[PDB]
Amino acid sequence: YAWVLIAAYVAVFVVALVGNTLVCLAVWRNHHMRTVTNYFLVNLSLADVLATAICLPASLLVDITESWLFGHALCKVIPYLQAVSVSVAVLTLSFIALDRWYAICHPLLFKSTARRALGSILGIWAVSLAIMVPQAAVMECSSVLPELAARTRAFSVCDERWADDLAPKIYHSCFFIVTYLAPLGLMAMAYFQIFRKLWGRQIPGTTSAEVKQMRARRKTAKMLMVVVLVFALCYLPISVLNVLKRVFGMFRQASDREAVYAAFTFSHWLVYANSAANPIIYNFLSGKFREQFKAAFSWWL
Numbered sequence: 001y002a003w004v005l006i007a008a009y010v011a012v013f014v015v016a017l018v019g020n021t022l023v024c025l026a027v028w029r030n031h032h033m034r035t036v037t038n039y040f041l042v043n044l045s046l047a048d049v050l051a052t053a054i055c056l057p058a059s060l061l062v063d064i065t066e067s068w069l070f071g072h073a074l075c076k077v078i079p080y081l082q083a084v085s086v087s088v089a090v091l092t093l094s095f096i097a098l099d100r101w102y103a104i105c106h107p108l109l110f111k112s113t114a115r116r117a118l119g120s121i122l123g124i125w126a127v128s129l130a131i132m133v134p135q136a137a138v139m140e141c142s143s144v145l146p147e148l149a150a151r152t153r154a155f156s157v158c159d160e161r162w163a164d165d166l167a168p169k170i171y172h173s174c175f176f177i178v179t180y181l182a183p184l185g186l187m188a189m190a191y192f193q194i195f196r197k198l199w200g201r202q203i204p205g206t207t208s209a210e211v212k213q214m215r216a217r218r219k220t221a222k223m224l225m226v227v228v229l230v231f232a233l234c235y236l237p238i239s240v241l242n243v244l245k246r247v248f249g250m251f252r253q254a255s256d257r258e259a260v261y262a263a264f265t266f267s268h269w270l271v272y273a274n275s276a277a278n279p280i281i282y283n284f285l286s287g288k289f290r291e292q293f294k295a296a297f298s299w300w301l
């Protein structure tokens with residue numbers, strides 16, 4: 001079990017870094033690949049690399065050693081950067097769907113540009129950095145017997161420190177709704193309307209150019225729906241496990257301590273596995289990204 005963890009964590013580390021760097025290079029090299037959607041997808045890669053590079057290594061040591069060995073300052077920074085990486089992801093996926101929904105379903109209300117996209121991308125970070133500040137405030141590094149901290153860090157853990165039972169129940173309920181259920185719920189309805197408008201609307205006088213627009217828009221909607229679907233599945237375990245632990249007070253009886261720790265461990269890895277999955281999704285569901293990933297691999301061999 002222990003080596004399978006390190007092997008899986010190492011594979012996700014390499015694939016996510018190599019893949020997400022190629023995702024930025026592909027949009028940079030190809031000019032008429034700099035679409036609003038693909039600019040948001042690059043911002044999604046910038047979040048994934050921040051999680052993979054910085055938070056993932058702390059991820060492996062905590063799940064194996066079961067203790068925090070990086071000191072008090074990083075106990076707030078790293079969990080904060082992990083939380084910010086999640087907010088940036090879900091907000092980027094939300095703006096993508098909002099962009100596609102006004103494009104496919106309500107075509108002439110708002111106009112999306114590359115100039116407005118970079119402004120949204122800077123807004124996604126301004127919000128993600130702000131709303132995760134309370135999370136960093138709650139992070140505290142403390143050892144079993146705190147007098148032990150003067151001797152070693154092998155027995156200290158970095159966890160949330162709440163002053164009352166009610167506060168975590170409200171906090172983690174709001175952040176499950178706000179950052180998982182609500183966005184995915186609104187997005188599932190948006191892509192369903194996008195699905196109906198792309199597959200089914202057969203108005204009699206559609207020009208040959210209107211169809212060449214649809215046949216390409218279908219290929220992007222197919223790719224983006226697979227991305228949202230994998231994101232929902234990847235973050236489902238950690239999100240439900242966090243709510244059952246914090247809000248519902250579960251997983252406190254040490255009779256099933258082994259199964260609970262193996263569950264949360266796999267849930268932590270699944271979060272990073274999503275960072276490696278997305279570039280793979282682009283390779284198979286996007287011929288333009290596939291074409292760019294082809295060239296980057298020829299230069300190397």
Ligand SMILES: CCCCCCCC/C=C\CCCCCCCC(=O)O[C@H](COC(=O)CCCCCCCCCCCCCCC)COP(=O)(O)OC[C@@H](O)CO
Pocket residue numbers: 094095097098101178181182183185186187189190193
């Ligand atoms: C989040 C952070 C803050 C926001 C930040 C911004 C991010 C926002 C992201 C995406 C926005 C996308 C908007 C997409 C809207 C699409 C929703 C939509 O139209 O759904 C229709 C109605 O559903 C229906 O009947 C049923 C209505 C839905 C009620 C059931 C919901 C169950 C709970 C599930 C979770 C809900 C969470 C909601 C938000 C908190 C589908 O039917 P139908 O084609 O006939 O419509 C015809 C009708 O449009 C005209 O008569």
Ligand SMILES: Cc1nc2ccc(NC(=O)Nc3ccnc4cccnc34)cc2o1
Pocket residue numbers: 055056058059060062082086175176179180235238239242268271
């Ligand atoms: C090493 C390591 N330790 C970790 C501890 C936690 C997490 N992730 C979460 O707790 N995610 C989430 C919590 C709560 N609501 C969410 C809503 C949407 C998405 N995600 C979450 C990753 C970790 O990686």
Ligand SMILES: Cc1nc2ccc(NC(=O)Nc3ccnc4cccnc34)cc2o1
Pocket residue numbers: 055056058059062078079080082083084086087135158159175176179
């Ligand atoms: C919406 C939302 N709410 C959230 C609450 C928490 C977190 N993430 C953590 O708490 N991460 C971590 C905590 C503790 N040790 C770690 C070690 C390595 C990496 N990460 C962590 C993400 C969230 O996203």
Ligand SMILES: CCCCCCCCS[C@@H]1O[C@H](CO)[C@@H](O)[C@H](O)[C@H]1O
Pocket residue numbers: 148151152153154
């Ligand atoms: C019985 C309770 C536990 C007692 C542990 C005593 C051995 C600590 S060895 C080691 O000492 C280094 C400094 O010399 C520190 O940098 C490490 O963090 C620490 O691990």
Ligand SMILES: CCCCCCCCS[C@@H]1O[C@H](CO)[C@@H](O)[C@H](O)[C@H]1O
Pocket residue numbers: 137138139140161162163164167
């Ligand atoms: C020093 C930074 C905090 C680290 C330790 C956190 C312990 C509880 S903090 C937080 O304080 C609020 C008032 O500010 C209260 O309303 C909350 O119930 C309480 O949970």
Ligand SMILES: CCCCCCCCS[C@@H]1O[C@H](CO)[C@@H](O)[C@H](O)[C@H]1O
Pocket residue numbers: 165166169170173174247
């Ligand atoms: C969106 C907000 C969701 C809030 C969900 C949790 C509601 C409170 S449960 C309640 O908590 C109290 C404080 O711990 C205890 O005194 C009780 O015994 C227990 O029944």
Ligand SMILES: CCCCCCCCS[C@@H]1O[C@H](CO)[C@@H](O)[C@H](O)[C@H]1O
Pocket residue numbers: 169247248249
């Ligand atoms: C056989 C009966 C078992 C009863 C106990 C089940 C666990 C209840 S915990 C309580 O549940 C609320 C919802 O009811 C949540 O909103 C609160 O956050 C949480 O604190």
